[PDB]
Design a binder for this molecule. Structure first.
Ligand SMILES: CO[C@H]1[C@@H](O)[C@H](O)[C@H](OC[C@@]23C[C@@H]4[C@H](C)CC[C@H]4[C@@]4(C=O)C[C@@H]2C[C@H](C(C)C)[C@@]34C(=O)O)O[C@@H]1C
Ligand SMILES: Nc1nc2c(ncn2[C@@H]2O[C@H](COP(=O)(O)OP(=O)(O)O)[C@@H](O)[C@H]2O)c(=O)[nH]1
Ligand SMILES: [Mg+2]
Lengths: 94, 824, 52, 189
RNA sequence: UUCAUCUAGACAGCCGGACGGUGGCCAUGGAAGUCGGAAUCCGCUAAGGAGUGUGUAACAACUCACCGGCCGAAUGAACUA
């Protein structure tokens, strides 16, 4: 699961525990990037990503705080790629 | 008021008629001179400039029967005993504060009007919160808020509102939930006021009852109609629950009107010399002048005017019996932490019930010394039972556990005495909850100690402080013909201060660890003029460094005899902290069976079982993290060499080649050794200097480095002052391990590894960086390797050994493996 | 004991400026010159050491 | 003037395809609420805030695309822009005259009305009591939670908001230095 | 001596927004725009820099870039002796 940039908002109603998942940019590169870019890189820096990803990242911006206010698929072709050094997909974003 | 020795003993038996407490104070807010006025006012006498030491001062409480008729506690009478200890001030002495809290049930809070509830107030306030002890607010120096400042009535109301509301925070955060309503609000008349340098004090509840007559409204609704949303109406004569009326005009709350307004008219009138209000307002508020009291003017006159209106004992000793808890209902939720042992146990249940004839329990927190040329007394509270002049009391030590001996001295008392601030009296007994002093227990116990009479009864709590003796300084003599006086003076400074700690240094100096510079320096001039009484030479405390290696030797070590015959070929490498730890901690012993000892070091420490069943020794002294692994096979006379090789090795691992000091993590793997044919060229004055010059080359080729000691200091302080502290690590290498806390308390316990070299004044700069708010908890953790070269008189490690070899009078240069190498 | 808003009012004419980096003197935090001759009307300043 | 020239061309293209527009004025907005109101109508009503590009639009109301620019042109005053749509007027009026929502106390902002506050609890832990400390208002410990002892009128009618007082005001959810995004003028066909 | 803003509407002044993904890749004892290096992208309008300083334990928060209000012509950056 999570290690760095994991913001999990806690809304408690007098003991009734329920934690919602804001699934940030690091959360998308783990729920899409299987065991290799998920765990095993604790003592070593994660800087490996280029291969095609597709439509699944458009619904990954849906888990990422949707405060953009216009188009989903459009804003993700920006967030995941230029800020993300692990996952390049289609060589056009940079 | 004088009371004979027996009148005290009769007063002592009545637990419902005896209040035992301390004084929760800041550095200087008015607690010493406030308590000084209660004695020359209503103080019990024997039968007929900073706080260095404290004692339980005694007084007499003679109240009215209808007064004790509103106290929620079991009580029968009005003949009470004031057993109050004058708790020490400022900081660094928070040592005797934890000790005054242990020998009492409540506490006298001494805050200020303008300097409200500062650091030391909430320090001793949060101290009483974790001791289940009850707090009672008393704002002193209210007169300075109307003399040097001259504050208005409604403005001075919100001045005390702030001091009070700031206490409602410290307490409603670190308090016990089984206590409930323990926060002091003048809404019940639990917060006092006054001036200690002028001899007076008052309460809202005093005039609530005093003016309950003049309004017909009882003292409970009179004072609940003074504070809060209660404003009187001098137009219609109605106490309305609002600041205005139908016209929308300004009202002065009942408090500032009927209470304060009267006192201000006294100031400017008396102080400024207006005899057009002196005898006038005298009779308007029911007061009288008499003799040479009429002949005084201004400053000295308004002093006597308060001694004519609200003297000391008035509001002070009044809230002492009315709201303060006596042992009866107090230890009825205190027993838990107060005694470290089974709660449903025999002696534990006796203290919650408080039986002054049953199970005798008496933990002496601090043994109070005297001018009796070195001998002291044992100041301790008698939880349950009665201590007599010559009783067989079980002197249990802080190490003792029910089932062994470990500091168990059950001896009879020489003589029994009473404590009166500075006066001792030859008495006999003292009951459950009351505190007394017993002579002779000292020559058996060590500083703090529990005293029982039952076998199944465990030990009573020995503090927890949460103050720690972080500081450390080297102490010696200025004349060796009186060095014997040096060690004996040091021994009495231990049974002198409860939070003080004396221990010997690894180098050969006498280390003095204190809470701070003030604390340490006081105990140094007291050890200078009293305890010892001889010239001392104090300089910064010298550290011991274990010479460690960081890789394998660049080539194979070579060294033979000066006579020239047999040679040594060893290859010294570094032992990992985990395996070198299993040596000094105890998982693989130097006297362990080589068969199964090697089995554990190969599958759990990752080694070759060959060289493992072949360990020659552990070192230095036979158990340190430096081994002699056997790796050769061409040695026919193996049984004639192992002995004296490890002989110069125990001198080599005990005396280092860099600056005459030991080593750490040095696993010497011997590849080959040229044997002879006879022990005449393989013996005593042969094998000693041979393995000596052999290990010199091995260490100077496997990477020379200096290793120093590391701390684990957890500084407890609120999140608001953390800024300055975090930067003191970014100052003297404070590498954070973790940072944990509770969901409802800001107070943060911060884990950070601290270097011995970067601690020669750590405590001073820490409270300076984030107020006294930073409480350091220093306790040694592990040995971390430096990273610099020791032969570099310019790198971290090299700088150290430069000044270190110049002090011993050794060689100015750092001799390498070239100097101690035997080659063709 | 001075009120946060009344404290900005105290700095408005005691320390909310810049110090000359030659002979030191009080000049606005936006001002970029010196009112002296010991330097010859210089441009050496710094936002007066924000003391904590 | 690269962008000044390309925007002139922009506004004209939308002003021709549609017949209904609104002169939406503001100044009391927020980066957040503004861009998020465009999300509300990402196909029904799109905003286009103009400027001296609208004094050029006086020379564009001079273009003669449909010269009814007379009853529109001079409504260029305050942070005002465009609102393009092709559906009924009262329907889209209800949508945009609901599309305006609150903004917090900017500690030192434009204080307009006198604020009152009931003597009850907020159910928070006593740590913010140090701010109510250097101001002066009694605070009770009910279940421990910070309780207001007075129905206090702290802020007066029209004054300079102090940094300290507007911070504990954000703790009570007080927001009057705002509006939202409304309108200055309307016009169809 | 240049450079390229500018009545189509700038600069000084002052009014109010100063976004989001995002506590961005990591790096993290702790770095959410504001210790560090490397990516310096588009969703969308009038704008919002993976962000200009102050400051936080990190946040928060304010303020600038940028952008709308009104003023309505200069007049500023960069160099010369
Ligand atoms: C609980 O109180 C503790 C803590 O304050 C801490 O553990 C303190 O540490 C003292 C030293 C402990 C080190 C290890 C145990 C190995 C090396 C020892 C030292 C020698 O250089 C380093 C620190 C400072 C002392 C030098 C100056 C001689 C030590 C010593 O007692 O020898 O000891 C007191 C009693
Ligand atoms: N302004 C003012 N000064 C006082 C008061 N009480 C004592 N002092 C002064 O404080 C001096 C010593 O105070 P101290 O006993 O050290 O205060 P403490 O450490 O809190 O007990 C006295 O000599 C007085 O002059 C008071 O009520 N008001
Ligand atoms: Mg004192």
């Amino acid at each position: 699961k999570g290690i760095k940039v994991t913001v999990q908002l806690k809304i408690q109603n007098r003991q009734a525990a329920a934690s919602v998942v804001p699934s940030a940019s690091s959360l998308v590169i783990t729920a899409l990037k299987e065991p290799p870019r998920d765990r095993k890189k604790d003592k070593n820096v994660k800087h490996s990503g280029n291969i095609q990803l597709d439509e699944i990242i458009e619904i990954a911006r849906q888990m990422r705080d949707k405060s953009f206010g216009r188009t989903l698929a459009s804003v993700t072709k920006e967030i995941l790629g230029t800020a993300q050094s692990v996952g390049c997909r289609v060589d056009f974003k940079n | 008021v004088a009371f004979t020795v027996d009148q005290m003993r009769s007063l002592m038996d009545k637990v419902t008629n005896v209040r035992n407490m301390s004084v929760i104070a800041h550095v200087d807010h008015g607690k010493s001179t406030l308590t000084d006025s209660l004695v020359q006012r209503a103080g019990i006498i024997s039968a007929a400039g900073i706080t260095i030491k404290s004692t339980a001062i005694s007084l007499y409480s003679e109240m009215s029967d209808e007064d004790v008729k509103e106290i929620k506690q079991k009580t029968d009478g009005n003949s009470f005993l004031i057993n109050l200890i004058d708790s020490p001030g400022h900081v660094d002495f928070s040592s005797e504060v934890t000790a005054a809290l242990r020998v009492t049930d409540g506490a006298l809070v001494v805050v200020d009007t303008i300097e409200g509830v500062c650091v030391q107030t909430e320090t001793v306030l949060r101290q009483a919160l974790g001791e289940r002890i009850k707090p009672v607010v008393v704002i002193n120096k209210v007169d300075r808020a109307l003399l040097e400042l001259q504050v208005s009535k409604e403005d001075l109301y919100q001045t005390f509102a702030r001091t009070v509301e700031s206490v409602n925070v410290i307490v409603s955060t670190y308090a016990d939930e089984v206590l409930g309503d323990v926060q002091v609000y003048p809404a019940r008349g639990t917060v006092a006021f006054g001036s200690g340098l002028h001899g007076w004090a008052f309460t809202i509840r005093q005039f609530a009852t005093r003016y309950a007559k003049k309004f017909g409204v009882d003292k409970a609704k009179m004072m609940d109609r003074l504070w809060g949303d209660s404003f009187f109406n001098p137009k219609t004569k109605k106490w309305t629950n609002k600041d205005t009326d139908a016209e929308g005009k300004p009202l002065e709350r009942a408090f500032n009107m009927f209470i304060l307004d009267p006192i201000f008219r006294l100031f400017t009138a008396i102080m400024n010399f207006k005899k057009d209000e002196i005898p006038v307002l005298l009779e308007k508020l029911e007061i009288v002048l008499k003799g040479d009291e009429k002949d005084l003017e201004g400053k000295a006159l308004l002093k006597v005017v308060m001694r004519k209106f609200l003297p000391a004992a008035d509001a002070l000793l009044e809230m002492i019996v009315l709201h303060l808890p006596s042992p009866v209902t107090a230890q009825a939720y205190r027993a838990e932490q107060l005694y470290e042992g089974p709660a449903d146990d025999a002696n534990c249940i006796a203290i919650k019930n408080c039986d002054p004839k049953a199970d005798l329990m008496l933990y002496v927190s601090k043994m109070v010394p005297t001018s009796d040329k070195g001998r002291f007394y044992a100041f301790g509270r008698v939880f349950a039972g009665t201590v007599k002049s010559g009783q067989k009391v079980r002197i249990q030590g802080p190490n003792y556990v029910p089932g062994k001996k470990d500091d168990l001295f059950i001896k009879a008392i020489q003589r029994v005495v009473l404590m009166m601030g500075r006066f001792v009296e030859p008495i006999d007994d003292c009951p459950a909850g009351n505190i007394i002093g017993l002579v002779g227990i000292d020559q058996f116990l060590l500083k703090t100690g529990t005293l029982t009479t039952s076998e199944t009864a465990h030990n009573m709590k020995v503090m927890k402080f949460s103050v720690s003796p972080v500081v450390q300084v080297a102490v010696e003599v200025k004349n060796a013909n009186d060095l014997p006086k040096l060690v004996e003076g040091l021994k009495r400074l231990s049974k002198s201060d409860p939070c003080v700690l004396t221990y010997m240094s690894e180098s050969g100096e006498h280390i003095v660890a204190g809470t701070g510079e003030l604390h340490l320096e006081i105990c140094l001039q007291d050890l200078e003029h009293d305890h010892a009484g001889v010239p001392l030479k104090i300089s910064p405390p010298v550290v011991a460094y274990r010479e460690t290696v960081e890789s394998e030797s660049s080539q194979t070590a070579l060294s033979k005899s000066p006579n020239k015959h047999n040679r040594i070929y060893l290859k010294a490498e570094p032992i990992d902290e985990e395996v070198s730890l299993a040596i000094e901690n105890g998982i693989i012993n130097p006297r362990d069976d080589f068969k199964a000892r090697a089995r554990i070091m190969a599958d759990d420490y990752g080694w070759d079982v060959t060289d493992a069943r072949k360990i020659w020794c552990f070192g230095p002294d036979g158990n340190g993290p430096n081994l002699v692994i056997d790796q050769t096979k061409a040695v026919q006379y193996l049984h004639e060499i192992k002995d004296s090789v490890v002989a110069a090795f125990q001198w080599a691992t005990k005396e280092g080649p860099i600056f005459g000091e030991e080593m750490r993590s040095v696993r010497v793997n011997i590849l080959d050794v040229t044997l002879h044919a006879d022990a005449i060229h393989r013996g005593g004055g042969q094998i000693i200097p041979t393995m000596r010059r052999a290990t010199y080359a091995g260490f100077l080729l496997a990477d020379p480095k200096i290793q120093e000691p590391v701390f684990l200091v957890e500084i407890q302080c609120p999140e608001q002052a953390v800024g300055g502290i975090y930067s003191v690590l970014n100052k003297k290498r404070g590498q954070v391990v973790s940072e944990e806390q509770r969901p409802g308390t800001p107070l943060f316990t911060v884990k950070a590894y601290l270097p011995v070299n970067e601690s020669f004044g750590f405590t001073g700069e820490l409270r300076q960086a984030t107020g006294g708010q930073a409480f350091p908890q220093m306790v040694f953790d592990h040995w971390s390797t430096l990273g610099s070269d020791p032969l570099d008189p310019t790198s971290k490690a090299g700088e150290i050994v430069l000044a270190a070899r110049k002090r011993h009078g050794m060689k100015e240069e750092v001799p390498g493996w070239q100097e101690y190498y035997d080659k063709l | 004991i001075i009120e946060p808003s009344l404290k900005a009012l105290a700095s408005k004419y005691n320390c909310d400026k810049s110090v000359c980096r030659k002979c030191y003197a009080r000049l606005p935090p936006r001002a970029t010159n010196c009112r002296k001759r010991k330097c010859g009307h210089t441009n050496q300043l710094r936002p007066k050491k924000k003391l904590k | 003037r690269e962008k000044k020239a390309e925007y002139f061309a922009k506004l004209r293209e939308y002003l021709e395809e549609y017949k209904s527009l609104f002169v939406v004025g503001v100044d009391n907005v927020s980066s957040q609420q503004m861009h998020e109101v465009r999300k509300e109508l990402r196909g029904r009503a799109v905003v286009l805030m103009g400027k001296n590009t609208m004094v050029r639009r006086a020379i564009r109301g001079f273009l003669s695309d449909l010269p009814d620019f007379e009853k529109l042109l001079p409504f260029v005053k305050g942070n005002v822009g465009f609102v393009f749509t092709n559906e009924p007027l009262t329907e889209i009026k209800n949508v945009i005259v609901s599309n305006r929502v609150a903004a917090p106390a900017r500690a030192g902002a434009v204080a307009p009305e006198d604020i009152w506050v009931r003597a009850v609890n907020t159910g928070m832990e006593p740590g913010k009591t140090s701010f109510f400390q250097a101001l002066g208002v009694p605070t009770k410990i009910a279940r421990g939670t910070i309780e207001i002892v007075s129905d206090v009128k702290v802020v007066d009618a029209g004054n300079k908001v102090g940094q300290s007082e507007a911070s504990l005001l954000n703790l009570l959810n007080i927001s009057p230095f705002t509006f939202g995004l409304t309108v200055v003028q309307v016009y169809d066909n």
